[PDB]
């Protein structure tokens, strides 16, 4: 759209400050911030005309602080974060008060404790002989488990090239412990190919899960490895067995 | 003051069907936009349309400002149209032009499956023989996959994949468990599945 936002993902501990940035379309005089929580319409936060903040949602408190110091980029700071702040934060701009063009968002998860953050374990499950016999097709299943927050991107790679045909991925991760706070998550994806393509030992299949985790400047005092942003993959080679 | 009412709240379409979504608003508006939020939660703009008509491929829209409603027309629906459609309006009584969003129409487009072959298969982990998943696949798109009542059994929702070069689509869902007791014969018991679902012996 021409509107940029950073960071795309943010994980933070409750009780801290976080700052997001929006870079609107050049020359656009108007800038808007909205919040969108799980399964809902966006809700207005604040509006700038040039550098002046001229409307703010009454539902929100002093701990939200937005600025647009040069009438260009804007920052939104959330002070004293709470778990209820977990949401997508969307910026939009308009040239002079007509069509609003939206940025790609910042997805914020506020956690109780950074010790709740874990990257995914990833496994590939290989096609059923019974499927191959019945359908002449072969489905691989990728399973990413035990991750938190739910900020992941899954892709499939066949012989070193990303594929989209024959793939589908769950649109949302499921909770592994839905009655538990900061439950970890699981996500599955399928890649289906012809049986002949799977049965060839020359073919290589990889499921890749990009995890967005802690940043370089995040403190880490736990004994286990720091759950930083990282890729975790699983893979299988074809075979006639 | 300004209110927005979208209808229908839920829409289920068979692939290829047309439909009309409606947005009713309470007073004069300066700005109106329709958006698509896909299942991943990404919000995309479809039309800026406070008045008049607009066309964009299979999608078109019309806003009748004097009667305070807007219609979004979807032609020849495809599975990728699934998601939530939002209408947003401002008020002609502030000058800030913040948007107030409707509660959305949730659209599910059901894939056309040429010849369903519902079956449940067991798949083993590429590394170890200990781990497996159960794959329910090739069922018709109207099939509903339920969650388990067993807290140690995990069942995904259904998704459709498209093997583009074979002109072939298929639905699937996955079940897995940490239990050594776990069986694919039992895995999808909470779902109502076809009487001719295939359960291979080996």
Q: Which of B113, B152, B119 is nearest to B135 (CA)?
A: B119
Work out the angle at residue A91's Cα, subtended by the Cα atoms of residues A87 and A93, and round it to the nearest 5 degrees.
160
Q: Do residues B181 and B153 lie in contact, with contact meaning Cβ atoms separated by under 8 Å? A: no
Same domain, A138 and A236: yes
Spell out which residues of chain B touch residue A99, defining contact as CB-CB under 8 Å.
31, 33, 45, 48
Same domain, A156 and A61: no
Min Cα–Cα distance to chain A from B18, Å: 24
Spell out which residues of chain B touch residue A137, defining contact as CB-CB under 8 Å.
163
- Any B CB within 8 A of A52 CB: no
Alpha carbons A125 and A122: distance in angstroms, whole number: 10
Same domain, A103 and A119: no
Same domain, A167 and A181: yes
Separation in Å, CA B35 to CA A100, A101, A176, B41, B46: 11, 11, 32, 12, 5
Alpha carbons A186 and A188: distance in angstroms, whole number: 7
Assigned token pair, A146: 């035990």
Q: Which of A96, A112, A128 finishes a domain?
A: A112
Q: Do residues A209 and A183 lie in contact, with contact meaning Cβ atoms separated by under 8 Å? A: no
Min Cα–Cα distance to chain B from A208, Å: 15
Same domain, A237 and A162: yes
Q: Which of A57, A85, A112 finishes a domain?
A: A112
User: In the PDB record, what is the listed experimental method?
Assistant: X-ray
The answer, yes or no, to whether the previous bond of B32 is cis (omega within 30 of 0) is no
Same domain, A158 and A93: no
Spell out which residues of chain B touch residue A239, defining contact as CB-CB under 8 Å.
none
What CATH code is carried by the domain that includes residue A215?
A: 2.60.40.10
Same domain, A179 and A141: yes
Same domain, A157 and A226: yes
- Any B CB within 8 A of A94 CB: yes
Contact B172 A166 (CB under 8 A): no
Same domain, A156 and A76: no
Cα A158 to chain centroid distance, Å, stands at 23
Spell out which residues of chain B touch residue A127, defining contact as CB-CB under 8 Å.
123
Question: Strands A74-78 and A64-67: what pairing?
Answer: antiparallel
Question: Strands B83-89 and B100-101: what pairing?
Answer: antiparallel
Alpha carbons A149 and A187: distance in angstroms, whole number: 12
Residue with tokens 């990404």: B42
b/e code B164-188 from CB counts within 10 Å (16+ = b): eeeeebbbbbbbbbeeeebebeebb
Cβ-based contacts under 8 A for chains A and B: 157
Please count the structural domains in chain A. Answer: 2
Please report the resolution in angstroms: 1.4
Contact B135 A166 (CB under 8 A): no
Assigned token pair, A38: 């799980």
Q: Which domain holds residue A213?
A: 113-241
Reading phi first (left if > 0) and then psi (alpha if -120 to 50, else beta), residue B57 is in left
- Any B CB within 8 A of A123 CB: yes
Q: Do residues A212 and A194 lie in contact, with contact meaning Cβ atoms separated by under 8 Å? A: no
Spell out which residues of chain B touch residue A98, defining contact as CB-CB under 8 Å.
31, 48
Q: Which domains does chain B have, with CATH numbers?
A: 1-111 (2.60.40.10), 112-198 (2.60.40.10)
Alpha carbons A19 and B153: distance in angstroms, whole number: 39
Q: Could you tell me which residues come within 8 angstroms of residue B61 by beta carbon, excluding any fewer than 6 positions away?
A: B34, B46, B47, B49, B53, B54, B70, B71, B72, B73
Q: What CA dihedral angle connects B154, B157, B158 and B162, to 10 degrees?
A: -100
Contact B161 A166 (CB under 8 A): yes
């Amino acid at each position: 759209t021409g509107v940029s936002q950073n960071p795309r993902h943010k994980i933070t501990k409750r009780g801290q400050n976080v700052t997001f940035r929006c870079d609107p379309i050049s020359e656009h005089n108007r800038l808007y911030w909205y919040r969108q929580t799980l399964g809902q319409g966006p809700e207005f936060l604040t509006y700038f005309q040039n550098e002046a903040q001229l409307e703010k949602s009454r539902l929100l408190s002093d701990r939200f602080s937005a600025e647009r110091p040069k009438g260009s980029f804007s920052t939104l700071e959330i002070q004293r974060t709470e778990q209820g702040d977990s949401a997508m934060y969307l910026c939009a701009s308009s040239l002079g008060g007509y069509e609003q063009y939206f940025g790609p968002g910042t997805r914020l998860t506020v956690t109780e404790d950074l010790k709740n953050v874990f990257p995914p374990e990833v496994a590939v499950f290989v096609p059923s002989e019974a499927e191959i016999s019945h359908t002449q097709k072969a489905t691989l299943v990728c399973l990413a488990t035990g991750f938190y927050p739910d900020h992941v991107e899954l892709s499939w790679w066949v012989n070193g090239k990303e594929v989209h045909s024959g793939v589908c991925t769950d649109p949302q991760p499921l909770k592994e412990q839905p009655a538990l706070n900061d439950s970890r998550y699981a996500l599955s994806s399928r890649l289906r190919v012809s049986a002949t393509f799977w049965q060839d030992p020359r073919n290589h299949f990889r499921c890749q899960v990009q995890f967005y985790g802690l940043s370089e400047n995040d403190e880490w005092t736990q004994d286990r490895a720091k759950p930083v942003t990282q890729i975790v993959s699983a893979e299988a080679w074809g075979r006639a067995d | 003051g300004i209110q927005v009412e979208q209808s229908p709240p839920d829409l289920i379409l068979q692939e290829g069907a047309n439909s009309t979504l409606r947005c009713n608003f309470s007073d004069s508006v300066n700005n109106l936009q329709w958006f698509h939020q896909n299942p991943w939660g990404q919000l995309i703009n479809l039309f800026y349309i406070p008045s008049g008509t607009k066309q964009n491929g299979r999608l078109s829209a019309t806003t009748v400002a004097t009667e305070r409603y807007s219609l979004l027309y979807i032609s020849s629906s495809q599975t990728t149209d699934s998601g939530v459609y939002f209408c947003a309006v401002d008020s002609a009584t502030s000058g800030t032009y913040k948007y107030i969003f409707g509660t959305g129409t949730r659209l599910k487009v059901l894939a056309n499956i040429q010849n369903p072959d519902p079956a449940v298969y067991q798949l083993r982990d590429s590394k170890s023989s200990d781990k497996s998943v159960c794959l329910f696949t090739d069922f018709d798109s109207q099939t509903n996959v339920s969650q388990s009542k067993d807290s140690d059994v995990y069942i995904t929702d259904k998704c459709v994949l498209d093997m583009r070069s074979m002109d072939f689509k298929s639905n699937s869902a996955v079940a897995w468990s940490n239990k050594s007791d776990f069986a694919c014969a039992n895995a999808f018991n909470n779902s109502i599945i076809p009487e001719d679902t295939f359960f291979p012996s080996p």
